[PDB]
A paper describes a structure:
During the early stage of HIV-1 replication, IN mediates integration of the reverse transcribed viral genome into human chromatin. ALLINIs bind at the IN catalytic core domain (CCD) dimer interface occupying the principal binding pocket of its cellular cofactor LEDGF/p75. Consequently, ALLINIs inhibit HIV-1 IN interaction with LEDGF/p75 as well as promote aberrant IN multimerization.
To understand the structural basis for the reduced binding affinity of BI-D to H171T IN, we solved the crystal structure of BI-D in complex with H171T CCD dimer and compared it to the complex of inhibitor bound to WT CCD dimer. As expected with the high concentration of BI-D (~5 mM) used in the crystallographic experiments, the inhibitor bound to H171T CCD dimers. Furthermore, the H171T substitution did not detectably affect the inhibitor position within the binding pocket (compare Figure 5A and B). Importantly, though, we observed differential interactions of His171 and Thr171 side chains with the inhibitor. The imidazole group of His171 formed both an electrostatic interaction with the carboxylic acid and a hydrogen bond with the tert-butoxy oxygen of BI-D. However, the side chain of Thr171 which establishes a novel hydrogen bond with the carboxylic acid was unable to form a hydrogen bond with the tert-butoxy moiety of BI-D (compare Figure 5A and B). BI-D binding to H171T IN CCD resulted in a significantly higher Kd of 10.3 μM. We compared the results for both BI-D binding to the H171T IN CCD and its WT counterpart (data not shown), which suggests that the less favorable electrostatic interactions between BI-D and Thr171 primarily contribute to the lower Kd value for the inhibitor binding to the mutant protein. Crystallographic experiments and binding free energy calculations have indicated that Nδ-protonated or doubly protonated forms of the imidazole ring of His171 can engage in both electrostatic interactions with BI-D carboxylic acid as well as hydrogen bonding with the tert-butoxy ether oxygen of the inhibitor.
Numbering used by the authors:
A (entry chain A), B (entry chain A): 55 to 142, 152 to 190, 192 to 209
Write the structure that this text describes.
C-alpha cells in the first residue's frame, strides 16, 4: 500500500568504510555503494544517479542531518525530489547479514556489497512469492499504467 | 521486438576521463558512470551492480577485447551473464550531445553525466510516447508476467 515514489536512504559502517544504502520502501528493492567518505557530496551524487533511474519523489532517512548540506539540497532541487517526514524494515541488518555470508568470497568490501545486493534483490519472497527486483518493476510499471 | 535481458556496454572518452555507458537495447534506457580507469576491474564491478538491479542475461559491446579479462569473466560467471555476439543506436553521440548541453551547469564531468542520464531516461519519445525509463520498467514487468 506504500507510495511507489518513496525511498529510504542511510549510511552503515563496516570495516572502517561507508556503505550508502537506498531502499525502495514499497518493494524492499535495494541499491548500495561503498563510498569513500560519509559526505554531502557523496549523498548528492548518489541521489542524482538514483533519480535518473527510478521515479524518485520523496526520500526519508533515519539521520535527518544527512540532508542538510547545500550540496544535497541542490541535488533534490534539480531532480525534483522532496524530503519525506511522515513514514508509518530493517535491511541494514539483513543486508549486513548477507554481506557477512558472502564476505570471504570477494577480496574487497565493495565487491561483497554488490554481491549481497544482487542476492537480496533476486530472492523469491514466499515464506505467489516474487523477489524485490520483480516487485519494484511491477509496482512502478503498474503506477505508469 | 528485442529480448529484454540484452544490454550493450561501452566506454567513451571526454575531458581525458572515461565514461562507462550501459544501454538496455529493447528500451533505450541508459546507466552510466565516470570511471577512473578504463580497466577490467572497473567493468567487472559495473557489471555486478547492473546485474543486481536488472535481469541481465547477455551483454554486447563494440570493443570485444573489453570482455577478455579474467576479472570481467569472473563477474559474468558469478552473475550468470553470457556474452551476446549476434546483434541485428547510437547513444554515445546522443548522450554526448546532452552532456554538452548541460556541461556548464555542473562543476564536474561525473555530475554532468548523471544529469544527462536523467534527462535521457525521462524524455517522452513521441516524434503514445513513453520515456526510456518507463519502457524499461514495462518491458521487464511484462516479461515477468
Ligand atoms: C579484486 C578482484 N580481483 C579479481 C582477480 C581475478 C578474478 C576475479 C577478481 C575479482 C572478482 C571479480 C568478480 C567477482 C568476484 C571477484 C566475486 C564474485 C562476484 O564476481 C575481484 C573483485 O573486485 C572487482 C570486482 C572490483 C574486480 C573482488 O573484490 O574480489
Ligand atoms: C561539486 C559540487 N559542488 C556544489 C556546491 C554547492 C552546491 C551544489 C554543488 C554541486 C551540485 C550538486 C547537485 C547538483 C548540481 C551541482 C548540478 C545540477 C544537479 O544537481 C556540485 C556537483 O558535484 C556533486 C554532485 C558531486 C556534489 C558538481 O559537479 O557541480
Amino acid at each position: 500500500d506504500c507510495s511507489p515514489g518513496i525511498w529510504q536512504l542511510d549510511c552503515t559502517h563496516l570495516e572502517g568504510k561507508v556503505i550508502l544504502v537506498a531502499v525502495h520502501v514499497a518493494s524492499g528493492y535495494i541499491e548500495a555503494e561503498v563510498i569513500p567518505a560519509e559526505t554531502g557530496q557523496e549523498t548528492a551524487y548518489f541521489l542524482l544517479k538514483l533519480a535518473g533511474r527510478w521515479p524518485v519523489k520523496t526520500v526519508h532517512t533515519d539521520n535527518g542531518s544527512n540532508f542538510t548540506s547545500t550540496t544535497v539540497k541542490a541535488a533534490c532541487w534539480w531532480a525534483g525530489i522532496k524530503q519525506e517526514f511522515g513514514i508509518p524494515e530493517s535491511m541494514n541488518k539483513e543486508l549486513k547479514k548477507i554481506i557477512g555470508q558472502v564476505r570471504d568470497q570477494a577480496e574487497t568490501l565493495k565487491t561483497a556489497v554488490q554481491m549481497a545486493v544482487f542476492i537480496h534483490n533476486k530472492k523469491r519472497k514466499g515464506g505467489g512469492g516474487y523477489s524485490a527486483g520483480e516487485r519494484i518493476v511491477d509496482i512502478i510499471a503498474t503506477d505508469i499504467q
